[PDB]
A paper describes a structure:
Here, we develop a general method for designing self-assembling proteins that uses predicted structures of oligomeric proteins from thermophilic organisms as building blocks. To evaluate the accuracy of our design method at high resolution, we used single-particle cryoelectron microscopy (cryo-EM) to determine the structures of one nanoparticle from each of the successful PDB seeds.
Aligning two subunits across the designed interfaces revealed that these were designed with high accuracy, yielding alpha-carbon rmsds of 0.7 Å, 1.1 Å, and 1.5 Å, respectively. In each case, the rotameric states of the interdigitated hydrophobic side chains at the designed interfaces corresponded well with the design models, as did the polar residues lining the periphery of the I3-A6 and I3-D12 interfaces. Several of the polar residues at the I3-A7 interface adopted unintended rotamers, likely due to small shifts in the backbones of the loops that make up the interface. Slight rigid body deviations between the building blocks added up to alpha-carbon rmsds of 1.6 Å, 2.2 Å, and 2.2 Å across the entire 60-subunit nanoparticle for I3-A6, I3-D12, and I3-A7, respectively.
Residue numbers in the entry:
A (entry chain h), B (entry chain k), C (entry chain r), D (entry chain o), E (entry chain d), F (entry chain w): 1 to 122, 130 to 178
The structure:
């Protein structure tokens, strides 16, 4: 399983509540990549992951995915697209999907005005709505490459029980 | 050619009225998969297609696609995404497209309020509008994998002649 | 399965109604032969099928039948005898039957006066009655060559429900 | 880099203003395909590129992409989807992406009412908004296949400096 | 890392609070064993893990530990001793330690009267104090076999901030 | 095609106007050399091209020319002679011409008094007239080595339409 969401949507809260009583392991993909790179001796510190040569970083992604595939059924956590100075970056290249072979991609959503409120209490609502629409396109592209199912989960501010009630049927 | 649409959009009516006088054979993909599985002795009854092992079901899709490719130019019929308890399932995995190599994907649409009306006379309008948006994303992803052209056809309740007039130029 | 009938008997209507909700593919044999010849590069236009050398046309029939046999169980559609300036031409030679191996030949019939009325609103009644008798002889010859069953279906003008009720038991 | 947009969005103006003082070469992809086909002796005139056999045209796309990859870092120019009588055609098939391996896809946008105004001074606003949405789906599918980043640039009528200020950070 | 504790000591709470913001993956060992056995086809349901042949269960433990060792630095979770009708069962046999090679064993403790209070609000205090003493012996035996460090963390009812302040320095 | 001119003659403006709507790629030679050296890992920044060993810089010129020759018909851009502290440097050595095999060298000119006016608004008129004469000698030497044609184009201050009308016939 892969769980995904825009920064501010409350991804970790819904995942922690829905995964309660589950026998499934819980895995941040960036953490595994750092662990694999560190045990291969390529890095020592978490920021060095951004300094690696891109074509070495492809093989770190490949090896991390092979090892998560060997672990078996898992709640993997990462962004589906990351916003950057040069625009949106796909969080899951084809060479990851060919190794992981996900059964489900789960996408968490809330209203742009709710997310803007949460972010202000910590982009325009138009840029939030854009990043959400780009995530839907990215998820369905990942699905078509892999045979993975795509689930959308709403997580409105007052209504965490709805997000958990929609998420738990997937597990 | 592949023809696709959401349940209730009137797909079969537009397909048969546009295919009138065409030399092209017509084919339901699920029906051919059942036929191939049955002639390979893997099943006897239509429900058993849901009971097959997924990694056998991949090869049944592959063989059905190879045989529909050997038949040549055809009006193939299937859903582009199927709604399920775990969310949207891609109806055409990459291993189907690499065998069929479609020249066109045709997508049928109507207003969510019309579709809700037809369904009530037999999901919310928002979930209908979502499933349409997910189908557009799926179709263009399938196109990029294959070189297939993508055509959208409107099929408003009274206006079947517009749908048929838009469809016939494709054939 | 093969469905057959004299021009004007309403062949397509009875097939379309009885095949409703069937998982079977729906194939015109002339269309397959054109598709096979076109993809073998032998022709580009449908009228060129009448211009092919007869011993090439035998192999086009043979290859079309092999590919329909690979597709498996199907509602195939063609005439059992075609009327021509030199008289009746058999629609299905032995080299087709040895490949398709049909389980059923279905023959649609109506009164010569009904057929003459339909044709007048679009041959003598004696020539219509002759062509029907020649079709029965052709069907039973095909049966004896192949082990196929032969079914006769009446389709009187008002009584389409009787034609469909006789046809549906075959499917 | 690849730069893309709908006809009327002002693609060339934003490209040439942002590329001012850049050491990067600029390349029209259709122009290179014509050049490669012409130097391979396949054509003499630009219109003959539409007359080529599709499976030859795949190899021309492949060879043009290999040569543009060997040139190195470049501002490549083409449409991401081309509107045709049979609907939208993908501008960049997978066999192009596996050769070019783009670092960025850039997508230029403007309001449908602005584009309709420019086109009227030279589709409905609904069909313009549709073609833009189909381009977003195409770009993100291309991204997932390649690891390319996706940037969106607004180019409103009076506001060319905003388009150039968004574009220059990519180069 | 391995985190361990007696049922009712609040193990999961202190782990969740201390692991906050860590890049380390989180793994229940029983979950991995079920996943490995399920993917090896040995079982389908979680209760069948108790029905396996003991010498198969040794090899499942061995394979699960090899796959966790390949994943690298991790917050592993399991009991150090499990209470059963036949008395205490060691949670981590030598064939697990030779694969995992832990750097730390972490042992969570609370007063027998606090644990009795938590268990009532849902063994004698003597049997609780015995099970704690047997865990200390088990942990220090595991340490001597492996070179792992052993840390004890108090988790008194109101004082969760002390438990988290002691746990976070280990990570 | 190669376009050439003295700094201040307005080379880019005449090229940009004449090449309007051309299918030809547009290429700065210094940019390609930097791109080739950068992708060979020899440099990271544009100024390091002056720091290269001359006998490496020859092979970079050779490889850049081979890759621009593989690209086919092109509007290449560079100076025909570069003024330096040690005098005039030839912009195109024999080892470049043997690879590019130009069909045309185009040389842009204006009155030394006009150029001095432009350079004042941004050498003596005698030194400007000298650099032009040295460019004519260099161009005709390049022609004799290669079989390239030589075209001279005037670009007087107001008369850009005359310059573009002389340039466009070459393309």
């Amino acid at each position: 399983i892969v769980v995904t969401g825009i920064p501010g949507v409350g991804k970790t809260t819904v995942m922690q509540k829905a995964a309660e009583g589950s026998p499934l392991p819980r895995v941040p993909l960036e953490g595994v990549m750092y662990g694999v790179a560190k045990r291969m001796g390529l890095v020592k510190d978490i920021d060095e992951m951004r300094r690696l040569s891109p074509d070495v970083q492809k093989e770190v992604q490949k090896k991390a995915a092979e090892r998560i595939a060997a672990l078996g059924d898992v709640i993997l956590d990462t962004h589906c697209t990351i916003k950057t100075p040069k625009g949106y970056l796909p969080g899951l290249p084809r060479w990851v999907l060919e190794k992981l072979r996900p059964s489900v991609i789960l996408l968490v959503e809330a209203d742009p005005k709710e997310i803007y409120g949460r972010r202000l209490k910590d982009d325009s609502e138009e840029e939030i709505a854009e990043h959400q629409m780009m995530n839907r396109a990215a998820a369905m592209a990942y699905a078509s490459l892999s045979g993975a199912t795509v689930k959308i989960v709403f997580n409105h501010d007052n209504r965490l029980d709805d997000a958990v009630r929609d998420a738990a049927p997937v597990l």
